[PDB]
Design a protein around this ligand. Structure first.
Ligand SMILES: OC[C@H]1O[C@@H]2O[C@H]3[C@H](O)[C@@H](O)[C@@H](O[C@H]4[C@H](O)[C@@H](O)[C@@H](O[C@H]5[C@H](O)[C@@H](O)[C@@H](O[C@H]6[C@H](O)[C@@H](O)[C@@H](O[C@H]7[C@H](O)[C@@H](O)[C@@H](O[C@H]1[C@H](O)[C@H]2O)O[C@@H]7CO)O[C@@H]6CO)O[C@@H]5CO)O[C@@H]4CO)O[C@@H]3CO
Ligand SMILES: OC[C@H]1O[C@@H]2O[C@H]3[C@H](O)[C@@H](O)[C@@H](O[C@H]4[C@H](O)[C@@H](O)[C@@H](O[C@H]5[C@H](O)[C@@H](O)[C@@H](O[C@H]6[C@H](O)[C@@H](O)[C@@H](O[C@H]7[C@H](O)[C@@H](O)[C@@H](O[C@H]1[C@H](O)[C@H]2O)O[C@@H]7CO)O[C@@H]6CO)O[C@@H]5CO)O[C@@H]4CO)O[C@@H]3CO
Ligand SMILES: OC[C@H]1O[C@H](O[C@H]2[C@H](O)[C@@H](O)[C@@H](O[C@H]3[C@H](O)[C@@H](O)[C@@H](O[C@H]4[C@H](O)[C@@H](O)[C@@H](O)O[C@@H]4CO)O[C@@H]3CO)O[C@@H]2CO)[C@H](O)[C@@H](O)[C@@H]1O
Ligand SMILES: OC[C@H]1O[C@H](O[C@H]2[C@H](O)[C@@H](O)[C@@H](O)O[C@@H]2CO)[C@H](O)[C@@H](O)[C@@H]1O
Ligand SMILES: [Ca+2]
Ligand SMILES: [Ca+2]
Length: 686
C-alpha cells in the first residue's frame, strides 16, 4: 500500500482532516435523540443536544458531501459515554453534547450511537477513503463538587458499567483535590481542576491502567488517529507513557491540544511536540494566519517568520495539525467580513506544511462568537460555495503532490500584503501566491522558482483570481500582475530518482514495533533501513515499495537515532532525525526529592542510567521539577515514563542555565513497576 492509502494510520500529511462537532452536523437517527430539557431539535439553544450522530456522518459520507470536498479524514467528538446531567450554569441549562464530560471511556454516547453504529461509521468511512480520528479527554471526567455530591454526576468514573468511584469521598484518590487552576503556571494548570471538571489522577495505578486499557478498546474498534484533549493540563511524563502503550501496541497519528495565545511562542510547547510521542495542534500557525488574513494585526513578514521559526522549532513540523479556527475561537469569518479572506486562509492552510484541519461549516461561510455560538448546526450541505470549490480543488494535492505533503517551505517573493512561497520535495514543486490586499494589485517581478520552464495554469483555475505562470530557464517567472485578493497555485510533479524520506511514524517506540517510512524514490525491491549506524535488511523489513516502507525497530539500546534508507542499488536517502527507541514498555513513575533548596531561577532535575532518564547527560535531564501543588518546595516532584521493571540508578541535579550541580554521594536505585505506577521518595544528598 502506498503512503496515500487510507490504511496508513501513521501519516496524515497527505490528508485533509474535517473536524466534526457530532451533535451539530447531522442527526441521521432521531431515535437516539436526547429528550425534553436536554434536547432541542431546533438547535436554537447551542448548549442543549441537537441530535447529530454517527448515522448523520455516515449518511454524509455516503451522499458525497465530504468526498466531494476532497476531505480524506474526519475528527469526531469524543465517542465515550458522557454524563446525562442537565447542569444549570446560573440560569442556563447545559448538556454534555460536546462529549467532554466523560463517565465511562469503555462505552459510547447513546446520543452519538452504539458500538455497532461506531463500527459501521468506521466501515463506511474507510470504504470511502476517509480516515477516522476521535477526540480523547483522559484529563478529567465531568463537572463535580466535593462537598455537594448531588451536583451533576459527581464527576463519577465507571469502568464499563462498574463504578470505579466519584469526586466526593474519593478515598482511592482517583481524582486530584487541589482546587481549580488559574493558568498561572504550567504545574498549576496540571495538578488543579480545569474549571470545575473532576481532575483524574494519573499517578493512581487504577486510573493509569484504566485509561490505558480504554484506548486499546478504541484502537481495537478501528480508529486511525487520536486528538488528545488538554495536553498542557496532564502530566507530560504520563503522557509519554500513554503514547508508549499506544505505539507499542497499535500506533496511530496522535496530536494534542496545547492552546497558544496570539503572539505566543512556547518552548515548553515545542519540547512537548518534540519528545512526547504525539504532535500538536498548530495554534502558532492558526493565530498568525488569523492575525494576517483576518484581524489585520501583522503582515506577510509575520506569516513568513512564523513559517521559518515553526519549521526549526518543531522537530516534526509536518506533524502539526493546522487550522484557521475551531470550537473555542470565534469562527474565522465575520458576517460583515469579505468572504475572500476566509477563502485565501483556507488555501493557505491546504497548501502549507503539516496536516490541514477544516472546522465543520467553514466551507458554508458560518460565523459566530465563542462558546457556544461557534458551535451551531451546519446550515447547509451546499457544494455550491467558493470555499467548497476551493477545498475541493486544493485538498487533493496533498495526495498527488508530495511537495505539498512533505515539502520544505521557502519564501520567493514578499511584501506587506503579498507572499509567494515554494513547497519542494524531490522532483515535485508547488508554488503558491497570495495577495491579502483586497483593494490593490501587485506587480510580481524578479520572482524565481524551482519550477521547470513551461506554462502553469492556476490550479484554482481562476476561482480566487489567480493566473497562469510563465517560467523561463532559471525557473525565472515572467513579470505578472497579482490581482487584488488573488490566490494562484502552480505545481509540478515527476518521479523522484533518489530515495527520499518525507515522513516516518511512529516517532517513539520499543524494538520490534513496526514503523512506516513514507516518501518517494524508495524503489520496489527491499533495500536497507538504518537506525543510526545499525543496518536492517530483508525480513525485519516487512514490506517495501516506492512510496512506503514497513520495518520493525532493531534491538538497539534506548536512544535517539537518525532514520535513513537506501534503494537496492546502495543509493542512500536523506536523514529523518529525532527517532526515539524506547528501552521497552513504559510505566509512569513519580519521583520526589526532598529538601533540595535552590536559589531563585535555579531548579532541580532528574538524571539516570536509562535513555528515558537522559543517560546521565544533564543536557537531556528531566525537568525542571515542580515544587508548588502536589509537593511543596524544597520538595520537588515529577512524573516520568520509565522502562518497565528495569532497575534504574538515578540522582538529582540543580541547573541554572547549562550550569549543573550534581547531588552528592551515591546514585539511588529503584526498580520500575511492571504495570501501573510507582512513587520514588528520596532526600537530596549533599
Ligand atoms: O511570582 C513570583 C515570581 O514569579 C516569577 O518566577 C518564576 C521563575 O521565573 C521561574 O524560574 C519559576 O521559578 C522557579 C525558580 O526558578 C526556582 O529557583 C524555584 O524557586 C524557589 C527558590 O529557589 C527559593 O529560593 C524560594 O524562592 C524565594 C526567592 O529566592 C526569593 O527571592 C523570593 O522570591 C521572590 C522573587 O525574588 C521575586 O522576584 C518574585 O519572583 C517572581 C519572579 O521574578 C518571576 O520570574 O516573587 C518571589 C516570591 O515573592 O521568595 C521566594 C520564596 O521565599 O522558593 C522558590 C520556590 O518557592 O522554583 C520556582 C518554581 O516553583 O517559576 C516562577 C513562577 O512561579
Ligand atoms: O565514566 C564512566 C562512568 O559512567 C557512569 O557514571 C555516572 C554516575 O554513575 C553518575 O552518578 C554521574 O556521575 C556524576 C556524579 O554523581 C557526581 O557526584 C560527580 O562525580 C564526581 C565524583 O563524585 C567524584 O568522586 C569524582 O569521580 C571520580 C570517581 O570517584 C572515581 O571512582 C573515578 O570513576 C570511575 C568509576 O569508578 C568507574 O566505575 C567508571 O564509572 C562509570 C560509572 O559506573 C557509570 O555509572 O569510570 C570512572 C572513571 O572514568 O574517577 C572519577 C574522577 O575523579 O569526580 C566526579 C566529577 O568531578 O559528577 C559525575 C558526573 O561527571 O554520571 C556518571 C557518568 O557521567
Ligand atoms: O468545563 C466544561 C467545559 O469543557 C469543554 O471545554 C474543553 C474545550 O472545548 C477543549 O477544546 C479543551 O480546551 C481547553 C484547553 O485544554 C485549555 O488549555 C484552555 O486553554 C486556555 C489556555 O490554557 C490559557 O492559558 C488561556 O490562553 O486561555 C485558553 C482558552 O482558550 O481552555 C480550553 C477550553 O476552555 O478542554 C476543555 C475542557 O475539556 C467544553 O467545550 C466547554 O463548553 C465546557 O464549558
Ligand atoms: O530575484 C530574487 C528575489 O526575489 C524575491 O524578492 C522580491 C521581493 O520579495 C519584493 O519585495 C521585490 O523587492 O522584488 C524582489 C524580486 O525582484 C525574494 O524575496 C528575494 O529573496 C530574492 O532574492
Ligand atoms: Ca440522533
Ligand atoms: Ca490535570
Amino acid at each position: 500500500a502506498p503512503d496515500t492509502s487510507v490504511s496508513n494510520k501513521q501519516n496524515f500529511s497527505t490528508d485533509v482532516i474535517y473536524q466534526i462537532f457530532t451533535d451539530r452536523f447531522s442527526d441521521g437517527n432521531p431515535a437516539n435523540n436526547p429528550t425534553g430539557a436536554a434536547f432541542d431539535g431546533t438547535c436554537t439553544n447551542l448548549r442543549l443536544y441537537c441530535g447529530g450522530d454517527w448515522q448523520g456522518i455516515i449518511n454524509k459520507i455516503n451522499d458525497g458531501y465530504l468526498t466531494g470536498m476532497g476531505v480524506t479524514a474526519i475528527w469526531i467528538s469524543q465517542p465515550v459515554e458522557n454524563i446525562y446531567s442537565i447542569i444549570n450554569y446560573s440560569g442556563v441549562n447545559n448538556t454534555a453534547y460536546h462529549g467532554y464530560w466523560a463517565r465511562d471511556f469503555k462505552k459510547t454516547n447513546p446520543a452519538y450511537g452504539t458500538i455497532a453504529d461506531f463500527q459501521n461509521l468506521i466501515a463506511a468511512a474507510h470504504a470511502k477513503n476517509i480516515k477516522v480520528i476521535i477526540d480523547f479527554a483522559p484529563n478529567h471526567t465531568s463537572p463535580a463538587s466535593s462537598d455537594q455530591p448531588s451536583f451533576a454526576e459527581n464527576g463519577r468514573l465507571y469502568d464499563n458499567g462498574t463504578l470505579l468511584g466519584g469526586y466526593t469521598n474519593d478515598t482511592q484518590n482517583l481524582f486530584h483535590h487541589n482546587g481549580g487552576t488559574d493558568f498561572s503556571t504550567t504545574e498549576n494548570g496540571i495538578y488543579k481542576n480545569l474549571y470545575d471538571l473532576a481532575d483524574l489522577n494519573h499517578n493512581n495505578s487504577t486510573v493509569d491502567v484504566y485509561l490505558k486499557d480504554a484506548i486499546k478498546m478504541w484502537l481495537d474498534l478501528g480508529i486511525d488517529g487520536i486528538r488528545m484533549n488538554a495536553v498542557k493540563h496532564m502530566p507530560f511524563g504520563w503522557q509519554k507513557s500513554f503514547m508508549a502503550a499506544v505505539n507499542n501496541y497499535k500506533p496511530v497519528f496522535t496530536f494534542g491540544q496545547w492552546f497558544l495565545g496570539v503572539n505566543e511562542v512556547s518552548p515548553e510547547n515545542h519540547k512537548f511536540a518534540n519528545e512526547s510521542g504525539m504532535s500538536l495542534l498548530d495554534f502558532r500557525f492558526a493565530q498568525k494566519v488569523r492575525q494576517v488574513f483576518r484581524d489585520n494585526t501583522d503582515n506577510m513578514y509575520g506569516l513568513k517568520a512564523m513559517l521559518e521559526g515553526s519549521a526549526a522549532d518543531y522537530a516534526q513540523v509536518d506533524d502539526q495539525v493546522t487550522f484557521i479556527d475551531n470550537h473555542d475561537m470565534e469562527r474565522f469569518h465575520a458576517s460583515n467580513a469579505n468572504r475572500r479572506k476566509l477563502e485565501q486562509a483556507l488555501a493557505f492552510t491546504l497548501t502549507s506544511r503539516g496536516v490541514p484541519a477544516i472546522y465543520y461549516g467553514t466551507e458554508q461561510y458560518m460565523s459566530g462568537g465563542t462558546d457556544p455560538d461557534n458551535r451551531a448546526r451546519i446550515p447547509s450541505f451546499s457544494t455550491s460555495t467558493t470555499a467548497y470549490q476551493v477545498i475541493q480543488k486544493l485538498a487533493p494535492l496533498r495526495k498527488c503532490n508530495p511537495a505539498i505533503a512533505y515539502g520544505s517551505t521557502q519564501e520567493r517573493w514578499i511584501n506587506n500584503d503579498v507572499l509567494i512561497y515554494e513547497r519542494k520535495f524531490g522532483s515535485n514543486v508547488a508554488v503558491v501566491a497570495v495577495n491579502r490586499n483586497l483593494n490593490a494589485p501587485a506587480s510580481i517581478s524578479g520572482l524565481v522558482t524551482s519550477l521547470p520552464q513551461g506554462s502553469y495554469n492556476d490550479v484554482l483555475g481562476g476561482l480566487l483570481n489567480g493566473n497562469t505562470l510563465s517560467v523561463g530557464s532559471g525557473g525565472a517567472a515572467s513579470n505578472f500582475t497579482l490581482a487584488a485578493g488573488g490566490t494562484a497555485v502552480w505545481q509540478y510533479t515527476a518521479a523522484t530518482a533518489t530515495p527520499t524520506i518525507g515522513h516516518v511514524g511512529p516517532m517513539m517506540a520499543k524494538p520490534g514495533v513496526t514503523i512506516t517510512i513514507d516518501g518517494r524514490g524508495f524503489g520496489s525491491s527491499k533495500g536497507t533501513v538504518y537506525f543510526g549506524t545499525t543496518a536492517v535488511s530483508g525480513a525485519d523489513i516487512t514490506s517495501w515499495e516506492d512510496t512506503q516502507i514497513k520495518v520493525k525497530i532493531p534491538a538497539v539500546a534506548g536512544g535517539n537515532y537518525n532514520i535513513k534508507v537506501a534503494n537496492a542499488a546502495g543509493t542512500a536517502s536523506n536523514v529523518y532525525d529525532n527517532f526515539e527507541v524506547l528501552s521497552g514498555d513504559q510505566v509512569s513513575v513519580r519521583f520526589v526529592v526532598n529538601n533540595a533548596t535552590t536559589a531563585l531561577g535555579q531548579n532541580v532535575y532528574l538524571t539516570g542510567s536509562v535513555s528515558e532518564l537522559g543517560n546521565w547527560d544533564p543536557a537531556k535531564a528531566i525537568g525542571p521539577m515542580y515544587n508548588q501543588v502536589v509537593y511543596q518546595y524544597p520538595n520537588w516532584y515529577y512524573d516520568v515514563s520509565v522502562p518497565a521493571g528495569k532497575t534504574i540508578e538515578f540522582k538529582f541535579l540543580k541547573k541554572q542555565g547549562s550550569t549543573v550541580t550534581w547531588e552528592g554521594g551515591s546514585n539511588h536505585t529503584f526498580t520500575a513497576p511492571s504495570s501501573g505506577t510507582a512513587t520514588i521518595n528520596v532526600n537530596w544528598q549533599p
